[PDB]
Amino acid sequence: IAKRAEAYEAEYRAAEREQIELARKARAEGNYFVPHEPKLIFVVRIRGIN
Amino acid sequence: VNIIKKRTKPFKRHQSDRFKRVGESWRKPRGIDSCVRRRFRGTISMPKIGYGNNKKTRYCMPNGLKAFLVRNVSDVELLLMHNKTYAAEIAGNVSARKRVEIVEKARALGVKVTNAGAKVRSQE
Amino acid sequence: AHVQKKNPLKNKAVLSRLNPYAKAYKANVKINSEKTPKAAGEKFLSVLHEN
Amino acid sequence: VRELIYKRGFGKVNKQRIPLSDNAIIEAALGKYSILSVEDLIHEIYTVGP
RNA sequence: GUACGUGAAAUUGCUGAAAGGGAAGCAUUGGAAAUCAGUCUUACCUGGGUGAGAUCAGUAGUCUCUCGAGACUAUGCACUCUGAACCUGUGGUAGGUCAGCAUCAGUUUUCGGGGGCGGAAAAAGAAUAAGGGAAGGUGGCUGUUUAUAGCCCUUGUUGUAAUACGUCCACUGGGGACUGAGGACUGCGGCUUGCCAAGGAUGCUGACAUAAUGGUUUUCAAUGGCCCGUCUUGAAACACGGACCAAGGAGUCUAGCAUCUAUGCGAGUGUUUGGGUGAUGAAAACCCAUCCGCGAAGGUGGGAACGCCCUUGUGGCGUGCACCAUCGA
RNA sequence: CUGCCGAAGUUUCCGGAUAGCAGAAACUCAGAUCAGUUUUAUGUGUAAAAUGAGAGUUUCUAGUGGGCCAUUUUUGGUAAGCAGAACUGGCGAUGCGGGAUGAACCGAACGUGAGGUUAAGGUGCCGGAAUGUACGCUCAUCAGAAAGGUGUUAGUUCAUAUGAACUAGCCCUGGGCGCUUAAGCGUACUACCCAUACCUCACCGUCUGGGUUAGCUUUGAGAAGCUCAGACGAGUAGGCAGGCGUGGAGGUUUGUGACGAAGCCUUGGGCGUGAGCCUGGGUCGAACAGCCUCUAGU
Known part of the structure; x- marks a missing residue:
């Protein structure tokens, strides 16, 4: 479990670094980069049962 | 525990204060348009199962003992092994003669008597 | 079992029960002060500072 | 994603709202899917795994 | 005390109490006055002495049971025991209520500090070598171009400036409130067998108790709340019924039918028309003769349960209830 | 007296039989089907992916078998309104916060409590909460919460600094006290107030899912017991369940009672969610009760 936590944190930090580096390059050479569409959202109910 | x-206060019957033919014993108001039955503000409460007390504390006097009604001196003997949780209530019609027999026996047994000073009188 | 609910964030001992990684994190990392390569396209700046 | 599962993440074990305060609960229910601890549960949610 | 058992409520008179600007009324929260709840260090343990007793005698008898288990009667008080009674202790620990702080735990609300990554790698700005420009023009003279103020723009400009914003910290330091449910032991973790903030509160103290904490009554203060039942009407509006109190007062008893459940028996079933009988209520109970009533007039697959296994588990091979499909009769 | 479930409020044929809703039982399956669901795609329907939930039968039996309001949809209207059908929800069986108050509006749907935070609405006072910050607009001599104006405010456009024509806002003319660069309006951003709502915990009950015997010195076998976990809690008609109480009856407590039964009153003390119960004091003077069943002029 501890090692699987190492891989997950490494995967998360690499993903954030890749996305930041992806946008820096596009801004550097002028092309426009669209980030990948997210697959996960968190819904919160706001209206009651009436 | x-x-x-x-809750301390008792549940009185609705409108039981106004009338005297109406008894204070709680009666469920079945009136079709009864707003007090309808739980409006400024009205009275109503018995619910939500008002029950702790099941490890139900029937317990404020000092923690549960009242136990002893008719004669035989009954006060069986509280030998529950003296820490039960208190020997003396029945109301037990005469002053057996009333002392119950209190003197219960004092040595170690149990607590709730009405040990009724109809009797000490002498030094 | 589980008489009470203890917050993994608030309680550090429950965190060790759930996170056998929290012992070694070192969350803060120096990823700067290494001749930062200022990245900005010149034409990107031109279209930024227009109208 | 991490904070909700830690502070407010309750399993569904035998149709009961069982809090996830120990890693044995997740693996007893999600052992067949190689989910064995809370970190894996976060990774199965955040990365949207199979 | 013959207006005579108990003497309730309505209702009325006297007294005491508080309250009393067109109601009252009740509910919450208290306060006040008035009044009750309940109080308890006391016992335990240990030490010795003194006299004891007995369930104890390197002891003697009877009784009832089943050798020894009781109840006793002598006899001695050791050997133990009786925390046995007293002196001896002035030895040691001290039962409820209420406040105080502390270390913790859960739920929180509120101030902080320190940092990571990201954004025009903030933008700026200062710093910073210039150029150009015009101004609301300094100097020169409204006009003018850095002067005897300079500014702005453009580069240049240190740099990886810093701040801010956004976000993260399994970074950290304080303040305050409300909770203690559970009751040996487990479990899961960390520190290193032990210990711990890890499967729910424990310590240190005090005061009160010999009143505090409490409860009840009247009243007041603040917040509130349109008369109940019926009927009407979505709803009300309503229209009714209600001067007050006590007592009386309305799905009951029975034959028939069907259903569900319980019991006895089960291809049976049911004594009580009647007879036998019943000495202690004998209208009960108990027993059975002849009728009579009501009943009575095969293959295929899916399947409950079980066995054999056997790569086990998975499944297969089967045997197949109730029943359902099917072919059937 | 308490606890659980709880409609329908009406189709459809035709006073009814149906149905439907709710139950109650019996079945078969979760490796099976579903959904006031959403997609995909084939031609709005149909068919085949996600999101969830176990889903489907048979039997028999209570109640309903109205409406009102609102939304919408239309048709006509008809002075004008409106009317007429529908359409779909809400109330009706439902309390609470707000709207001055007020059944239809805005919130939110209910066990008893402690803390926390909110929704709608609010923070001048009554009134819990900033006489908050920034920016404007409003002058009413009826504010405020069709038009005209020697009415302003900002102005725009066009003419040659001035006018004309205009643009728009607002005023004038046609809940209380008070408020006036607001305590009015309009926008924005902070902070705060509080509901039967949301969170965390306690407790009562309900349902559901467990655990428990060669009854192991944890002793917790009234197995009808003890124990563990989670969610839940409006309610009429109606269905189901457990209890409290009265008179008398067989059993029982080797029950109570002239040293005071039953009864009665009383701001005495307790117990139970409650029906009810136990007890102290005062009167009182001859009977009475707890428990298991039987029973009814309860």
């Missing part, structure tokens, strides 16, 4: 009650 201390003796804590969800």
Whole structure:
């Protein structure tokens, strides 16, 4: 479990670094980069049962 | 586990104060348009199972003992092994003669008597 | 079992029960002060500072 | 994603709202899917795994 | 005390109490006055002495049971025991209520500090070598171009400036409130067998108790709340019924039918028309003769349960209830 | 007296039989089907992916078998309104916060409590909460919460600094006290107030899912017991369940009672969610009760 936590944190930090580096390059050479569409959202109910 | 009650005041019947033919014993108001039955503000409460007390504290006097009604001196003997949780209530019609026999026996047994000073009188 | 609910964030001992990684994190990392390569396209700046 | 599962993440074990305060609960229900601890549960949610 | 058992409520008179600007009324929260709840260090343990007793005698008898288990009667008080009674302790620990702080735990609300990554790698700005420009023009003279103020723009400009914003910290330091449910032991973790903030509160103290904490009554203070039942009407509006109190007062008893459940028996079933009988209520109970009533007039697959296994588990091979499909009769 | 479930409020044929809703039982399956669901795609329907939930039968039996309001949809209207059908929800069986108050509006749907935070609405006072910050607009001599104006405010456009024509806002003319660069309006951003709502915990009950015997010195076998976990809690008609109480009856407590039964009153003390119960004091003077069943002029 501890090692699987190492891989997950490494995967998360690499993903954030890749996305930041992806946008820096596009801004550097002028092309426009669209980030990948997210697959996960968190819904919160706001209206009651009436 | 201390003796804590969800409510002190009794449940009186609705409109039982106005009338005298109406008894204070709680009666469920079945009136079709009864707003007091309808739980409006400024009205009275109503018995619910939500008002029950702790099941490890139900029937417990404020000092933690549960009242136990002893008719004669035989009954006060069986509280030998529950003296820490039960208190020997003396029945109301037990004469002053057997009333002393019950209190003197219960004093040595170690149990607590709730009405040990009724109809009797000490002498030094 | 589980008489009470203890917050993994608030309680550090429950965190060790759930996170056998929290012992070694070192969350803060120096990823700067290494001749930062200022990245900005010149034409990107031109279209930024227009109208 | 991490904070909700830690502070407010309750399993569904035998149709009961069982809090996830120990890693044995997740693996007893999600052992067949190689989910064995809370970190894996976060990774199965955040990365949207199979 | 013959207006005579108990003497309730309505209702009325006297007294005491508080309250009393067109109601009252009740509910919450208290306060006040008035009044009750309940109080208890006391016992335990240990030490010795003194006299004891007995369930104890390197002891003697009877009784009832089943050798020894009781109840006793002598006899001695050791050997133990009786925390046995007293002196001896002035030895040691001290039962409820209420406040105080502390270390913790859960739920929180509120101030902080320190940092990571990201954004025009903030933008700026200062710093910073210039150029150009015009101004609301300094100097020169409204006009003018850095002067005897300079500014702005453009580069240049240190740099990886810093701040801010956004976000993260399994970074950290304080303040305050409300909770203690559970009751040996487990479990899961960390520190290193032990210990711990890890499967729910424990310590240090005090005061009160020999009143505090409490409860009840009247009243007041703040917040509130349109008369109840019926009927009407979505709803009300309503229209009714209600001067007050006590007592009386309305799905009951029975034959028939069907259903569900319980019991006895089960291809049976049911004594009580009647007879036998019943000495202690004998209208009960108990027993059975002849009728009579009501009943009575095969293959295929899916399947409950079980066995054999056997790569086990998975499944297969089967045997197949109730029943359902099917072919059937 | 308490606890659980709880409609329908009406189709459809035709006073009814149906149905439907709710139950109650019996079945078969979760490796099976579903959904006031959403997609995909084939031609709005149909068919085949996600999101969830176990889903489907048979039997028999209570109640309903109205409406009102609102939304919408239309048709006509008809002075004008409106009317007429529908359409779909809400109330009706439902309390609470707000709207001055007020059944239809805005919130939110209910066990008893402690803390926390909110929704709608609010923070001048009554009134819990900033006489908050920034920016404007409003002058009413009826504010405020069709038009005209020697009415302003900002102005725009066009003419040659001035006018004309205009643009728009607002005023004038046609809940209380008070408020006036607001305590009015309009926008924005902070902070705060509080509901039967949301969170965390306690407790009562309900349902559901467990655990428990060669009854192991944890002793917790009234197995009808003890124990563990989670969610839940409006309610009429109606369905189901457990209890409290009265008179008398067989059993029982080797029950109570002239040292005071039953009864009665009383701001005595307790117990139970409650029906009810136990007890102290005062009167009182001859009977009475707890428990298991039987029973009814309860």
